[PDB]
Amino acid sequence: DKDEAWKQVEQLRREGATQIAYRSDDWRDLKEAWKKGADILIVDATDKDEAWKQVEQLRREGATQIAYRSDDWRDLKEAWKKGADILIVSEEMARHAPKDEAWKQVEQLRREGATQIAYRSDDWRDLKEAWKKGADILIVDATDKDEAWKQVEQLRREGATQIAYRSDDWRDLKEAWKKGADILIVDATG
Ligand SMILES: [Cl-]
């Protein structure tokens, strides 16, 4: 629900968070979240066609940290061309053309100015290996909050510099933040 999701952004802003993220398929929803305190606007392209047009509008509106969630490297490339600077990928990307072709293609983009790769997983080893191969942002997606907070904590101890965590509940996001997460993704897509 849009109203409740926006409220999560607002409460996190009131708590002092400065790297709030917001995930939606709709640029108008993302623009409102931006107004309310979200700095990272995640365009959800997971089941949509030409979702890079959402990136185009957000670019026009003046947002500077637009992310694009896709496991299709050609689609991520087009999103980058349309103004996305954070490319959010997962294990599903290595599905097609095995031998890191997809990963390697997103790595070519990472060499383009401030372009960053974010890798999401619910699996610790997956996340660690993605970090080793050059992921800039590590999104802890385990739904066992106990396991997720242990992973946020260990990433901090191991020196990961941009740990992210996703929830539909600002209270969980605040707990992740306290434990070392810097990027707090409000995600009411479910
Ligand atoms: Cl995401």
Author numbering: 1 to 190
Lines quoted from the article behind this entry:
The design called sTIM11 is a monomeric and stable protein that with its X‐ray structure provides a suitable starting point for further enzyme design approaches. With its compact structure it does however lack an extended surface or pocket as usually found in enzymes. Here we took steps towards the goal of diversifying de novo TIM barrel by extending sTIM11 by a simple structural element, namely an additional helix that we inserted in a loop at the upper part of the barrel.
Since the two halves of sTIM11 can assemble into a TIM‐barrel like dimer, we believed the loop in the middle of the protein sequence to be maximal tolerant for the structural modification and chose it as the target site for the helical extension. We further introduced a small change to the sTIM11 scaffold by removing two cysteine residues that were originally introduced to form a disulfide bridge to improve barrel closure. The introduced helix showed elevated B‐factors, making it more difficult to model. While a helical structure was formed, it is wound slightly different than expected and forms a 310 helix instead of a classical α‐helix. Due to this, several polar contacts that had been predicted between the first residues of the inserted helix and its surrounding could not form, but a polar contact between Ser90 and Asp71 is established instead.
